[PDB]
Design a protein around this ligand. Sequence first.
Ligand code: NA
Ligand code: NA
Lengths: 279, 270
Amino acid sequence: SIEVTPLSAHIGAEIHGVDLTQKLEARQIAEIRAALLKWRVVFFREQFLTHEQHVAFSAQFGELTLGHPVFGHVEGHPEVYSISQTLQRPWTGWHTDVTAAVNPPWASILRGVTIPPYGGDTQWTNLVAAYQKLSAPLRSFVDGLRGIHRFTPPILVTEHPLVRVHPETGERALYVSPSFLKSIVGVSPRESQVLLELLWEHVTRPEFTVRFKWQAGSVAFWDNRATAHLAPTDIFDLDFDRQLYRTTLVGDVPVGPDGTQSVAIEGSPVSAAAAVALN
Amino acid sequence: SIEVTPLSAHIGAEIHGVDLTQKLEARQIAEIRAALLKWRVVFFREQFLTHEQHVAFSAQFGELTLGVFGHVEGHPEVYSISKYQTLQRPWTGWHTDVTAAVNPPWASILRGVTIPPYGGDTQWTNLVAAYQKLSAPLRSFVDGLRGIHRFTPRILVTEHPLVRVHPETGERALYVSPSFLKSIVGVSPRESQVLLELLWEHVTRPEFTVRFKWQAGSVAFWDNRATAHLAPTDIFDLDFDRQLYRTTLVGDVPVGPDGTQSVAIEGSPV
Ligand code: NA
Ligand code: NA
């Protein structure tokens, strides 16, 4: 029986009592999965893993994505991605991974190998809590809306529901991936702009968020169907080296409250892997 | 010699190696004060203090303010922070202590006594870093501006500089206390509104902030001349009691880059 230590009112929890270098029992896997669904992102400490152990841990929860030939490439490990002026608004940098694709990954597992003594914190926000905190007329309104997500690698275009029904819990997530969601289908450009800024300001309210200060050996495991996250920018500032590795798990096509699946509009398989590797 | 452990690139540090139940020696006091000036807010863990010890620790750094509100029996210097629809913007709730007064307290010391297992985190933002990250034309513009801060519970109105020159470090702070600053003097209402929302969005950017998860016996000590902070809103959201106690230290009248002191408009000083 794992130990689960929540970190805020509704998002984030530490898990202790699990040795991630070892294969886990079925009960441990189910307990971790339930904690992840409940707290949206779960964290481990003092887990010093090889690439093989990181992949082996990940495969207990789903199918691993297979990477990009250049971006984040780790030799011998296609499943492992290496992680080593803008117009500034409250939602700048906040995103859900690869939502420009028709089947975004449902989860990611990020481990810290070389971690600075300070700087480089990551944040997550709870898109289910955010949906629920919209007023009832706003919820009914966005239930029926669709959004275009775009990404251009250094071109993916997908139409997603603005409200994603979680396939394991049935909860509704405000699926507004701010870095990638560009427009709301069927409304005017100004209507779309105003509504997106309203929802993006909403989802970044502190009551929906948790902040994580990394240490060497830390692991973050988050549910992309219910979260967006924010990468640090204070690292490009300090002298410290920073090396993390990420795996991600293949997800299904999102569905909105009316049952309509997401629709691919444009995109190459190569462009999708670049988004997985870079987002 | 104290141990200082920074918590972000430019704001927040934990201090270890000090027993706050005892009178500190002058070297320890000086080291804590330097760490406070450098990191804007400093934190202590596992410091289980009486009200008397809280006051005594505070008095080593300045003069205690003497505040029915938050009343603590036998200790007029200690304020009780007890658990017992607004318009939501990024700056909602962010503030610098009592800037509606002509002499806001220069520091506050907040200690946690009854602390929820989760929920109730506090955040601070670095107003000096925020000033410095404005572009040069924006810095020069706000250097010359004044703002009206108001509080009505008696009624306090004060004109402060928008840029406060720190009396000990000489640094410039973007002194925009979002809960209390209401208007910019000498510009139109719409100009004031737009510029305040610009600066308030700016000062709440995550690169300027630090978040602190309380535990029982934790202490936060912050420099109000260089910070604003944000209280948690999840308190009634959860069925956990939450009890903290606060002391504050008497501050001086702020000064802007041109040397102009703040001006009391209505009300009495701290
Ligand atoms: Na990402
Ligand atoms: Na306050």
